[PDB]
């Protein structure tokens, strides 16, 4: 289980590329079960020939890079190098092995590293992009330290990010796309609908038009009035005294569900209470600012224009 | 020149995130846009911040200097672990192609004017930096979440060779404001989103099987159903960072019982986007609404 | 306090000598006075007996009940009771009995001034550390009071939310000593508690007493009579009965929560008032107050033509909501399931475009001409650089 | 009354301004006066009294005792401040002083909320109280002291109830220590009632109250009163924020507010509106 935000990961591609072959460092911190590399920075190594450990490299290097830090929070966690992952082999295996022992710098909580290997060609075949490994026996001195790899799963973050980039891939039907103003309102039947329409709809030209719009007003208009009559529709077809089989049966009891729910509600609200008018009246607030924002716009556009 | 169509991994927050790393809120200008001309296009990479904090109390001699000098040494270190690599064969990364702002109510004047626009686009023709103000999460969710990326004015011998000035009488002022205004630059504008990277492709093929992807859905089904809480959140304290904004703009033009100094024409602020964008977000706001009480009609 | 704290403080903890500083200056001596301070320290690691801790544990206990904080000095205390309990150093059995020594003096102090999330915490710390035999019920017991409190972080009243942001920035320092950097709640105080051996052990009694307390229950009369006297004897404990006074306040607030859930709205009051336990026991008066004051969230509880109304959650828009969606002309569940088939179809394709496996050709174009350009770009810029200098 | 009455008429607050034993007998009488008013038993004239001579200056050396900063170390200048005045076997009582300004303020200052005039609080204390020894953070709790129990009063008599506020104060570390008497007592607990009645509606979310009738005299904690006299003068209104449908008959109040947080958004709109129609109206000018 590494831990890898996503800007880390299309850095990676860049640095695998383009040269043959690259290695680097990677930086981050650790918490329990898991590993957080969280940034990275490259290196001049050649990792097929032996350059440039030594482990005075190594040593070099992590003075190099705490100096460009301090924050605790980025600590050197190990290396990343290009290529190669078992034809091969021994070359990136041997630069591992030298690299520890003559040196035991620095920074470390547990005898450790993190491998993560980059291919640097894109392939896929039976190839894995990047492959992250974490080192076990682990013999703490073997002639300079000696290894074997337990295979690690690469995962990513937590919060926004990841959930950021899974959203983007999503909306591609039309478009392909950041997360940018008009759209989104997300409240789902209908919202999400009418925001597919809008980026449809957008995109154009920035306009072969005056005068005036049919494009998202009849598709938003349009697909409440379907199920305003669709509603209706199935509603009716219930009320010829069939609770089964009509329509599969299975349209009516949603609709029949729909309609007891509203009337309920309503029963309920006034007065005690009128809760859902009150919220319709802080739309109306909010229009009314809208309205008065795109006045103050005319306004300033009267003085920008009269003023240029 | 060298901005000349910017590729943006962005979706993966790969500046953003960087900067988020070294914390945020923050309230000024913070650093450097950095990245490099591939094909087609200049991939903004990587960013590094030079770190300027002067001591706020009390001040009084040295240690401002002190900083700033410190700020400076510091940010050529972080550069070079970067840059040093790119020359000694190719790594990569290079090369200055913009300037940042990180969460700011909103960017002033004299830090677009005078801490940009000064000398330092008046040192280069064809304004390959750009700056580029970010507010995303601050002032809610969508609507705001890209971006603004300003090509900085100014060439600047109009109105500089002696020396600056305003009047309190307006005309004269205006006509070489207005010639300084046109090369540049007003707030103009960038293209984003409009290349496919190609170094996405570690991203693209995560995760998908299976964790992301699950958790992905289930977090967008329940966001579907909710929506309530988050309406407290957004609607009234957007209406505060406006109030704020604008009241500061009367201040700045209405100065106060007399006279312009204005801007002398307006602006390289934010005051137009500002106007545009409250009207959008409350376009977002007044149709969600409407939906959500349509449907219960 | 202040004087003694700082004794220890200037004596091992933290050490750097001091003073010196080597040479000798022109001062003779010092040698001997360096000396005799690391034979000090280290003796003190470990030589048998700390009496020390005791002592410590007595006056920090004595400093709390006093008048009971002010600026006082039991802060500084903790502050260097925490350094010193950071023996380590030597290990483990003297140190260990120092440690349960250590962290029950701790815990207890919370109690009388609110408090109650480090208490949970440092409980479980002891309970982790200790418990065969005497040991073993009172950890046990403790359980009560960790399940009691803590389900919840900041929170209520309005006008206020500032004073709030402030006292949970307090806890999360408090917090570093302590040895997390948040205030502990919730879910995480149950899931340590679960990994060791601590709720598991434990007494099959407590375990079903906090079982009742910790989860929906419902009738609420019934099952909070049943925790009373379980509270007022078994374990036979007298930890409970003190522990008695929150967590009948705590029953209620519980009811409340369940009530608006399950339920659109409620009848409430007179259910409330009956569960307090009977009659001659209830004016209305106190009793009334004490459920209008009491609420874990912001709600209506107000009326006065007799009975409470809520106005919150609105289960009946949301379970419309629902009925709407599924039918419909379908028309929701087919088109999230193709949006759904759609990203990994379209992610397949321009994984394999970039791969070997519909292209291969493009990416090596893109990457001959990316290198040219760098490269460019890199040379203009150094350049600019070696003629400006020059 | 007397005394203030002498004051004010006799113009004597323009020859103490020089002749300078004269000005700490003007000290001495305005902090008289104050604890006088406190103490047959009204807030006001007493606060206004009081909180003047407070709040500044420091620095007091001005009645008792006490020599200013910084004296009594430097050196021979001692014997100013050393004979201006201060006279002995007086003072009247520090502590006395403070407690009856402390209270005043509480008293006074709290009821001016609406909601939300948020509110720079009007004495040299109260500010500091916050970041000072409220705050969030002195180590970790817990009253009763001393002068935390005002601390304490104020917190309970804020939200909630009265009964709380009035367990602290009666009682316990605090009053006895007037010599004028049971008097004060009685009359600042009715004070207390009434502001603590005052403060309570705004608040409960977001109305309901009178619950009920016979209850809200009970309660609220004194019984059993005007007992309409004292009830409708604490509602009463209409400024500011609307109540009421009150129905006295059934003494039930149909308060309907519409609203609380919609009334705030209007008027963030409202003076949004005013700074633009200023500004463009001096640029019509120009």
Known sequence: ?308 | PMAQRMRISFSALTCLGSYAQNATCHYALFGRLCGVQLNETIEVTNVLPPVINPRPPEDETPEQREKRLLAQQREERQMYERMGKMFFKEELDSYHVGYFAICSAYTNAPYSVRTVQQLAQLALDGNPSVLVVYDPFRTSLMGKLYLRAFVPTREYVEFYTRLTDKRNILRENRLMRECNVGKGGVLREVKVEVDVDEYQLLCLSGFNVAPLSSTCRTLHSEVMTDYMAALIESVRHNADELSRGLHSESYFSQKEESYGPLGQRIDTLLKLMQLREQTQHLESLCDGVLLNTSLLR | GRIADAYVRFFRRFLLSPIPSIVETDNPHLITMHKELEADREDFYKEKPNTDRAVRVFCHLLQTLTEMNSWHAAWSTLQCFTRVMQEITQHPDPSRECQIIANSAMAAVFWKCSHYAFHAHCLGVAAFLTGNGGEAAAAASRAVLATLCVPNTNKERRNFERGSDSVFEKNARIAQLFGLQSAPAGLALWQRLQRMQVFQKAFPEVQALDGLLRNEMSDENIARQAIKQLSIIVQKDPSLEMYEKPLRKVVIQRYLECMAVRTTRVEASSLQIGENEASEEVYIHEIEPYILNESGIAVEIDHKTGFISFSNTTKMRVLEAFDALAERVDFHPPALRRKLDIRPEHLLRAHDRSSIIHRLQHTCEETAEARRQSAKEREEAERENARLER | RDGRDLVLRSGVEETVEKSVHLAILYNRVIAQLGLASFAAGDVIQAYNLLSSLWSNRNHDVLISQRMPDYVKENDEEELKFRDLLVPPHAYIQHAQLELATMLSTLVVDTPKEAKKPYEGSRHQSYFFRIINQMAYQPLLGDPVEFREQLTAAYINLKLGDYAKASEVIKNMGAWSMMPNGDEALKTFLQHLKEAALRIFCYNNRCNFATISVDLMMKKYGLNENEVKCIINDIISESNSSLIAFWDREDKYLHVDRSNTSRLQYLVEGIAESVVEVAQYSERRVR
């Open chain 1, 1 to 308: 289980t590494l831990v890898l935000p996503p800007f880390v990961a299309a850095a990676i591609v860049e640095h695998a590329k383009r040269r043959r072959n690259s290695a680097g460092y990677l930086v981050g911190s650790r918490s329990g079960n898991q590993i957080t590399v969280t940034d990275y920075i490259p290196c001049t190594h050649e990792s097929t020939s032996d350059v440039r450990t030594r482990a005075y490299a190594e040593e070099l290097k992590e003075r190099v890079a705490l100096k460009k830090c301090y924050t605790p929070s980025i600590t050197l966690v190990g290396w990343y190098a290009a290529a190669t992952p078992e034809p091969g082999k021994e070359r990136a295996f041997d630069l591992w092995c030298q690299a520890p022992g003559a040196s035991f710098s620095k920074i470390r909580s547990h005898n450790q590293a993190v491998m993560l290997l980059g291919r640097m060609p894109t392939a896929a075949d039976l190839s894995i992009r990047w492959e992250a490994y974490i080192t076990s026996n682990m013999n703490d001195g073997d002639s300079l330290q000696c290894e074997r790899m337990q295979q690690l799963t690469v995962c990513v973050e937590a919060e926004t990010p990841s959930m950021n980039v899974l959203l983007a891939e999503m909306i591609s039907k039309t478009l392909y796309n950041g997360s940018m103003p008009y759209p989104t309102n997300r409240i789902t039947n209908l919202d999400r609908v009418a925001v597919e329409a809008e980026s449809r709809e957008a995109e154009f030209g920035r306009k072969d038009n005056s005068r005036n719009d049919a494009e998202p007003r009849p598709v938003e208009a349009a697909l409440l009035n379907v199920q305003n009559k669709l509603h209706q529709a199935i509603s009716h077809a219930r009320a010829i005294l069939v609770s089964g089989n009509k329509n599969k049966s299975e349209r009516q009891n949603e609709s029949a569900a729909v309609v007891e729910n509203y009337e309920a509600i309503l029963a309920e609200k006034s007065q005690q209470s009128s809760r859902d008018d009150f919220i319709t009246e802080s739309y109306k607030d909010a229009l009314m600012i809208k309205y008065t924002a795109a006045l103050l716009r005319r306004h300033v556009m009267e003085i920008e224009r009269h003023g240029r």
